[PDB]
Ligand binder design. Structure first.
Ligand SMILES: CCCCCCCCC(=O)O[C@H](COC(=O)CCCCCC)COP(=O)(O)O
Ligand SMILES: CCCCCCCCC(=O)O[C@H](COC(=O)CCCCCC)COP(=O)(O)O
Ligand SMILES: *[C@@H]1O[C@H](CO)[C@@H](O)[C@H](O)[C@H]1NC(C)=O
Ligand SMILES: *[C@@H]1O[C@H](CO)[C@@H](O)[C@H](O)[C@H]1NC(C)=O
Ligand SMILES: *[C@@H]1O[C@H](CO)[C@@H](O)[C@H](O)[C@H]1NC(C)=O
Lengths: 537, 538
């Protein structure tokens, strides 16, 4: 059972399964290939005709594992995965600037439904909309009387989306993944009504790197989120990630990354290194950008690829963008999984003392923090086995001596207490703009990892397993997309208090939720807030 | 959704008919080895099991993918997380796993009398199940060649549920349970397969890796007595990657240490009857305990914690001695190897980078009955030149780390590829009139770092991916063999596969062609292994 949409730019053949029409792999910009590799995305000028989108869309090139750093087993797999046969088997190519659109059966151009615009996460190195199907979430929306359009996009990750250095900067080529996101937003503004969505009711939603991207979209161009005189979105939902302090795109880390990629791509000593890169064949290029340290490794959260201030797209370090009121402030929901850091403390298992955590940070994370400052920060975290993450689990879950501590720290600085700082600053500069925040605990007891990073994809995005957490959060979100307030629309079980009222949040278990003070780990949070700037990665 | 019923001597099962093939998955063949029957030989059902729905996916026996107590921390972490009940349930894995799958052409009845291909999965005696070995592709090919058969794929217990050893296990008569599961499935087939349209006098057994070793062990079982109710349980064997595994006894030092470790982790140390105590341990804790020892995915690599070991009754002696003593059921047989058997297993032990280090590694984990002088002599038959090692014939390429291609060559040769030649040689000496055919697979030549590596035949041959000369010729040879007892008789073949003992030639099969070659490569290493086989008892 198929279904045509015609829109200004082309038309589209989707599938209608159990009450849901799905269009997968709708092109939104020109394939960033040859000429257009390592260049900003470009809109389609001419009509692109009729594409069948009853299939499975492509992914952008992935970096699951480094081809040049980390344990040999991982390097081996990292290289094997890059061979054409596998790239082809996974539908991954530079031809990836496509999105998916899912809607309830029978929706028409006449329809004026709210839009839910999803940005996947994968440490800015991997990820794709291929395994983010909005069926369960849209199904709940219909069951609640609050139907919506679901849009899930691809964007360039790894060295295809976030290569930096002085050359990229001058080419105006910084932060391509963000621009892919932005241009996907503008495409939605031009085309989504044809699909029966209200382009004036777009809510952007992301997890991890996608959540950070949500804040970045709010920040883009000094907070100018306007397209043809109208805002590109009206609300934002952030799961695990917001502001990421970061040195400039032409900074030392990014330049070192760029020079290494250029060496591996076989482009050193050439006249235009950046021009040369676009000459290198895919496989060789993929291998070279993937050669740097990857998230699955000792390096962990000290990412090789991430958004960095360029001065136009990302005008400044995100924390300063907030303090200076240079972001589109919109109603927003932000949350964290209770144990965000555990996954990221698994590999750096030789970091087992304050002194070693400090060295680790000075080696890879924070070039503009003194040994003294970092030592102070880490010392706000007890060595006490019981104080670490997974939180509230006693002497248990210590994978290695110092694990729960490191997990606590990595999880707080990057996501959970970072979130509170974000909330605090936003409440100060834009007090009239509402926010709601929550903590997820529905996997309490899960050995070693607890309610760890990305568990929300299962429990919330897919509703597995079906329980109080699944119902409550889904309903809050769908409410928020519909009304711009999680407590408005369908009837809610607990009134979610605005964060700036008392600085309370919802803590959501499998069985129930409760309102609690967002003041845990106060000394750690204090130091981070008062010293946010030294934490630029 | 079309169903088909089969009544047979022990019950009735309902299967599914799909695109010309009928499948019955999860047919019970022995009582569930749970409670008092954990760590006991399997027992046939003594009562009719009634009517069973077998139109879904069957279970697996408990798996050991990764050790819970040894190896890198990431692997221990994952090894532990995999064992939680939620995941065991999601993968349909539990102790109640003695079931098998039967697939046959649509329209087959009890009068069809088709030959039977009986498949034994490989998984290093630590993991594996019939769940992902669906014979649809092979049976489809059989049907298109006018040589239809019944495909039977079994579960058997692995890891500490199937190959736990030590003197307590030995005295209990509970050695080598996983081999007993395969054997009791063969007997179930003898009694029951005619009801499904198969001919029990035409059973060919086939396995890859641990399953291939298991095929030879089935020929070896009970001093070579493969008879049941007066009839042979199989008439042929196909061995992909593995045969004879010289091994110290089930009550030897290695096996006892594993047992003592498991008992202590399971909380049974010091009890009056530790083995009886193990049977009372809760599944999740028992699983964690048996999986606590070193796993194949680690530094220990192919120095396995679990494998068949001589017990004096089921496996009467070390396999090489069984062959020399002519105490195995000698059947027509096909045996092959992937060209680069060792590459996968040399990835993890990447600090083993010199002759001296290879020997220390072997002395420490592998061969307790080999001297340093002997092991050094064996290793010295392998050149240190990058071009000599595995992936073979790839020159200066594929050196994952210095010494890798060499370690890969040694691991693959001693365990699989030259062991195969020694097996063929001994068999031709004591049973000269029993035919054997052998081949080397090179259809993945050029694949980076691993070459035509261990288990690549699961894709190319078992599933026929991708369709090419290799899938075509091997499937046809195997199907001919199942039907006629000779890979060359049945459907016309492109190349006449010579019997091995005639001139000691084998087929070498590439993706697009095959050639006859001499089975005499790496002669010096072979010669040493052959003349000193007993020192390589693992
Ligand atoms: C094959 C994967 C299936 C995962 C099921 C997800 C369950 C999530 C939740 O809804 O269930 C919850 C929690 O599940 C467990 O904490 C383990 C989940 C681990 C998640 C990552 C693997 C139900 O448990 P319960 O509190 O007993 O109701
Ligand atoms: C979805 C991908 C898996 C199918 C692989 C096919 C295997 C056999 C052969 O036909 O393939 C190989 C494919 O390439 C490599 O040599 C081997 C692939 C490695 C697979 C191991 C995971 C056939 O090559 P060709 O001669 O080009 O047909
Ligand atoms: C820990 O291991 C990493 C490699 O994963 C290494 O770079 C670092 O120097 C080591 N640090 C300590 C303190 O052992
Ligand atoms: C080693 O050989 C002896 C006889 O010399 C034998 O009894 C013993 O079982 C062997 N041990 C191993 C490891 O096979
Ligand atoms: C190699 O590494 C393993 C694990 O790190 C270690 O146990 C073993 O002693 C090493 N072997 C050598 C150096 O021969």
């Amino acid at each position: 059972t198929t279904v045509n949409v015609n829109y200004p730019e082309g038309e589209v053949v989707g599938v209608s399964v159990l009450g849901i029409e799905s269009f997968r792999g709708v092109p939104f910009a020109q394939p960033p290939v040859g000429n257009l590799r390592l260049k900003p995305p470009v809109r389609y000028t001419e009509n692109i005709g009729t594409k069948d989108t009853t299939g499975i869309g492509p992914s952008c090139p992935q970096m699951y594992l480094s081809t040049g750093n980390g344990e040999l087993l991982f390097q081996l797999v990292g290289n094997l995965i890059n061979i054409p046969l596998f790239q082809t088997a996974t539908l991954s190519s530079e031809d990836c600037l496509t999105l998916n659109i899912q809607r309830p059966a029978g929706t028409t151009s006449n329809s004026s439904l709210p839009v839910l615009f999803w940005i996947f996460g994968g440490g800015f190195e991997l990820g794709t909309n291929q395994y983010y199907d909005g069926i369960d979430l849209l199904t709940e929306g219909i069951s609640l009387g609050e139907p919506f359009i679901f849009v899930a996009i691809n964007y360039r990750v790894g060295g295809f989306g976030f290569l930096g250095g002085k050359e990229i900067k001058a080419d105006g080529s910084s932060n391509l993944g963000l621009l892919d996101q932005r241009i996907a937003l503008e495409w939605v503004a031009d085309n989504i009504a044809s699909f029966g969505g209200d382009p004036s009711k777009v809510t952007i939603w992301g997890e991890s790197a996608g959540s950070i991207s949500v804040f970045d979209q709010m920040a883009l161009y000094g907070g100018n989120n306007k397209y043809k005189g109208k805002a590109l979105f009206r609300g934002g939902i952030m799961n695990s990630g917001s502001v990421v302090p970061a040195a400039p795109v032409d900074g030392v880390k990014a330049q070192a990354i760029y020079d290494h990629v250029v060496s591996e791509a076989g482009c050193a000593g050439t006249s235009d290194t950046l021009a040369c890169l676009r000459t290198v064949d895919y496989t060789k290029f993929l291998t070279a950008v993937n050669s740097v340290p990857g998230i699955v490794s000792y390096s962990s959260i000290a990412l090789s690829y991430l958004p960095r201030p360029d001065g136009v797209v990302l005008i400044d370090s995100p924390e300063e963008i907030v303090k200076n009121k240079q972001y589109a402030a919109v109603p927003m929901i932000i949350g964290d999984q209770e144990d965000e850091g555990t996954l990221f403390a698994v590999l750096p298992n030789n970091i087992t003392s304050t002194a070693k955590i400090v060295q680790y940070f000075q080696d890879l994370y924070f070039y503009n923090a003194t040994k003294e400052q970092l030592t102070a920060f880490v010392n706000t975290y007890p060595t006490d086995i019981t104080a670490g993450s997974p939180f509230n689990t006693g002497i248990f879950n210590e994978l290695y001596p110092g694990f729960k501590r490191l997990a606590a720290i990595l999880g707080d600085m990057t996501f959970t207490l970072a979130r509170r700082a974000f909330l605090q600053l936003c409440s100060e500069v834009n007090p009239d703009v509402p926010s709601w925040s929550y903590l997820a605990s529905y996997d309490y007891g899960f050995p070693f990892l607890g309610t760890f990073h990305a568990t929300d994809i299962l429990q919330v995005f897919y509703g597995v397993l079906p329980n109080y957490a699944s119902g409550s959060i889904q309903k809050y979100y769908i409410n928020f997309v519909t009304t711009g307030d999680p407590n408005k629309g369908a009837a809610v079980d607990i009134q979610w208090p605005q964060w700036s009222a008392k600085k309370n949040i919802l803590q959501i278990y499998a069985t129930k939720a409760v309102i609690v003070a967002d003041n845990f780990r106060a000394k750690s949070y204090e130091y981070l807030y008062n010293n946010i700037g030294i934490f630029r990665i």
